[PDB]
Amino acid sequence: IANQPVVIDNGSGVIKAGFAGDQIPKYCFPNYVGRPKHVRVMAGALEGDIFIGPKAEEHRGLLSIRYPMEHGIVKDWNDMERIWQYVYSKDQLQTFSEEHPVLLTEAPLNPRKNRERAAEVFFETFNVPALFISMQAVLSLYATGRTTGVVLDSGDGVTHAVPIYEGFAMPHSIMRIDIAGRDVSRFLRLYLRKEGYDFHSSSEFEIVKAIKERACYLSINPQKDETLETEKAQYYLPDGSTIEIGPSRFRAPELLFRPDLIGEESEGIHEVLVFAIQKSDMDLRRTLFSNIVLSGGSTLFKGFGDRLLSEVKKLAPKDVKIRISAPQERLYSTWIGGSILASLDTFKKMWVSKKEYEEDGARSIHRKTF
């Protein structure tokens, strides 16, 4: 059918889109807010005020980039609708809300009000015929071919693990701590001011984000490597100024493992996953030692996987098999898993009909997603 489903790969900071069966999302872009800040007299500027694209990524000195997705939980749903209208733009989709099924990606254990308000959007403003939201973990296993596993991921300020065998109902066996790289970038900015580099703008912060995600690693031996001497090699600004390596690009991401340094009692991914293993059953934990379904795009740094394996060695007992899912396209793999998921037979019954929203919607939405 020409009414092919719509795969929308969300994320706390990144979002992708496409159709069913497609292998690459032709539309990949962030999640933010933006509006101009100065005054022109001579005409010939761009209008619309909320731009997404090269102009947005060019006229950064004008817009006020914000982020409504507080740990993914969005608050400027209206602005998101504006963004979704942009998703339907003349160069983006050119389709109408009442023309295609829509599969949506998600982060679990969120309040019902989220799905409520989303249903209101895509069934009143937008009017989707078939809308469904689910867990990317299943999509991840689809993209990897596995069926059972401990699916862990990292967004931008969100992290969560789903240790489940073949989609079996194990809600008590699920862990989630939503914290990641955004504050690490702000923490990096803190280090910058610590050695005299103050930054405050949204665009400025995004440049810092580029610095972070561009230059960061993990020195396996914290104390030991600290005793040694660094390089402090300098990258250069658009103007070309000093960007040293510092203790920063490796000491700052370790805060994700020693979260108390930010001033917050937490556990660190390793302990989190260990607790998740304890949340499992001894008659399955061996497979779970083999079941290491890792993901998360923020995770893509140096000194990450193998050092984390050493962490596991310190944590897990004897006889544990490392079987880590780790291509860098695990983000896209969620979108791809949803694409193949959309290309299915039973998928019709899997979604939510529009008439169901016309009848009740809400409770039925929670019933179909569970």
Partner: peptide, 24 residues
């Protein structure tokens, strides 16, 4: 493949699965 070309990139000189030491 063009899949890795059109995107920012996949794993660089490092696999996905690893393994512990012999006789753990």
């Amino acid at each position: 493949d063009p899949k890795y070309a059109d995107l920012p990139g996949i794993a660089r000189n490092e696999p996905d699965v690893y393994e512990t030491s012999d006789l753990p």
